[PDB]
Amino acid sequence: TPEEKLLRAIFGEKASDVKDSSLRVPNGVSGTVIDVQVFTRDGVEKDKRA
Amino acid sequence: AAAQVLSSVESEIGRTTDPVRMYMREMGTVELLTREGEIDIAKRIEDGINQVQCSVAEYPEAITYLLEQYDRVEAEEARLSDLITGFVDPNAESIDPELAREKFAELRAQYVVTRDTIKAKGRSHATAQEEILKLSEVFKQFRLVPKQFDYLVNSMRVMMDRVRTQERLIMKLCVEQCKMPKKNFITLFTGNETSDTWFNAAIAMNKPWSEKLHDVSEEVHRALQKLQQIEEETGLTIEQVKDINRRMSIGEAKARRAKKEMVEANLRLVISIAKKYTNRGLQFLDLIQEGNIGLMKAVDKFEYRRGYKFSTYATWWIRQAITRSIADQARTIRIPVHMIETINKLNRISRQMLQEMGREPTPEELAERMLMPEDKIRKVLKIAKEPISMETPIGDDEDSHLGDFIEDTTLELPLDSATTESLRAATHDVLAGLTAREAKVLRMRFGIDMNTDYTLEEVGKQFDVTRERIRQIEAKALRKLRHPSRSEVLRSFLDD
Amino acid sequence: ERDGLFCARIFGPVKDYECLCGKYKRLKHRGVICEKCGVEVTQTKVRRER
């Protein structure tokens, strides 16, 4: 809307093309993580995690 | 001759609505033809095609329309297009313009020596008749590729429809108004053919039923002016055109009944080759219909001088028909034919590789074998997937079906609409708290309370000529709106 | 597809104020009729009633 574009022109946040689609728990029941298992790809580099 | 058995069959049938049994009970009337029995059918096809081509060759202006189209394709100084490939390509009992000149020079010479001798001593003089027969025997040597040949047949069809439409209009208006019997009409329409002397003879005959004629004559001898215009443009009699059209109708009807006898005796070859191509791609009655269309297209282009049987030639056409039918839709989406071909090739290579190696078809070996890039193989393996239906029974009870776990993302949140409705009133209060002309500039600048957002030149044409002062007003408005005391209620809206 | 069962020219626009062409964005264009795909720029939820 032009109101949010006016707010962007006044305050000055660029808001680049990166969306916040991280893994969140809906109404998260708290606790303790046991272990993280990560699968890899034969063509894509695993990149430091596993 | 076979309905007595079919009546005893249908007496047992308890109103079967399934078209498969119905189709293979109506097609079982005609038995199998012999091997040399279709040679006479092919000869009747030859006689019908030759009669149609003789009816075309007796039409004198076909050479005129052919030379007109040849001048239109010869006009603009340089053509080697696909329209030239639709021309003659003469058969014996790679087209160069030199042979075209060498074979069209004497054709133009015969045309200009035939056209000048029309008015010599009569319209249907015997020497002129021999010249017309000689020109027709010259024209029958060069026979067209059937694209432009069927185009000229359709043009002759349009001309015949115009002539018969005018004649039918005259006949229906006469029957509607004067109610003239056919005995006094057909004889005069055959005999006179040129002038209104039969009309004067109908006036001279008393006939008190014909007294309702004077108020319609202004259309009666107006509709014959169109026939006079047709005779001025053509120069032919009605009876010869009717005889040519009757011979063309016979030559089409012989080939038509031959095609009837061919299809009623070869539906069973179609069903025998079609029941082995039913690998669950689509319901098979469409495959039967497409096989019948392929049978028609194989009969329409069948040769006799080859000496082979028709089944081997028709098998390729009917497999092409079944292939394009199974590759036409094949899904709920549209996939082209070459994509289906590449998917089938990759499926056969993957099946052979799983048979030889014994494990899963890893696409790296496929890319090393078929010299294709790996991302293309990923794309082809990713696109090819059948969609899932809208019911999909999961549980045992009739409660768990779809219309659940799937949401529509077009309907947005009511909280965002509430924050938008609060932001509208907040910006309205901000614009009301400032200067009114500043409010009008900030509204008509970015499209607030307007339909379109005006550019700087449009604002310059509306408000004032100076455009740098508008930018100074915008900078002053931004400096006045960077203050936190006037935007403390707007700082909470910054995260959205 | 233009002449289709899920089309945008006849069976409602899939998005509000947007053509099938992908060119008539930038909301300043109001009320115009497209010459390529021919999608009238109307509001949402019209696709369910055409």
Dist. CA B237–CA B243, nearest whole Å: 10
Shortest Cα distance, chain B CAs vs residue C4, angstroms:
11
The verdict on A11 touching B (C-beta cutoff 8 Å) is yes
Hey, are the CB atoms on B451 and C44 less than 8 Å from each other? Answer: no
Q: Give the residue carrying structure tokens 């006799």.
A: B304
Record the tokens describing residue B271, joined without a space.
Answer: 């069903």
Record the tokens describing residue B70, joined without a space.
Answer: 């040849």
* DSSP annotation of C32: -
Q: Give the residue carrying structure tokens 């038509």.
A: B256
Shortest Cα distance, chain B CAs vs residue C36, angstroms:
21
Residue B168 CB neighbour total at 10 angstroms: 11
Ordered DSSP codes for B212-233: TTTTTHHHHHHHHHHHHHHHHH
Report resolution (Å) to 1 decimal: 4.2
CA dihedral C4, C10, C13, C19 (to 10 degrees): 90
Q: Which amino acid is at B388?
A: I
Ordered DSSP codes for B324-372: HHHTTS-SSS---HHHHHHHHHHHHHHHHHHHHT-S---HHHHHHHS--
Record the tokens describing residue C2, joined without a space.
Answer: 């233009």
Hey, are the CB atoms on A7 and B374 less than 8 Å from each other? Answer: no
Nearest to B384 by CA among B312, B331, B438, B460: B331
Q: Are B300 and B317 in contact (CB under 8 A)?
A: no
Confirm or deny that B137 is annotated as ligand binding: no
Dist. CA A46–CA A23, nearest whole Å: 19
Confirm or deny that C7 is annotated as ligand binding: no
Confirm or deny that C19 is annotated as ligand binding: yes
Residue B391 class from Cβ within 10 Å (0-12 exposed, 13-18 middle, 19+ buried)?
exposed
Shortest Cα distance, chain A CAs vs residue B464, angstroms:
23
Residue B45 CB neighbour total at 10 angstroms: 19
What is the Cβ-side half-sphere exposure of residue B381, based on CA atoms within 13 angstroms? 15
The approach used to solve this structure was cryo-EM
Hey, are the CB atoms on B494 and A3 less than 8 Å from each other? Answer: no
Which of B421, B481, B491 is the best substitution to test chain A (most A C-beta atoms within 10 A)? B481
Q: Provide the total of helices (H) and of strands (E) in chain B, helices listed first.
A: 20, 0
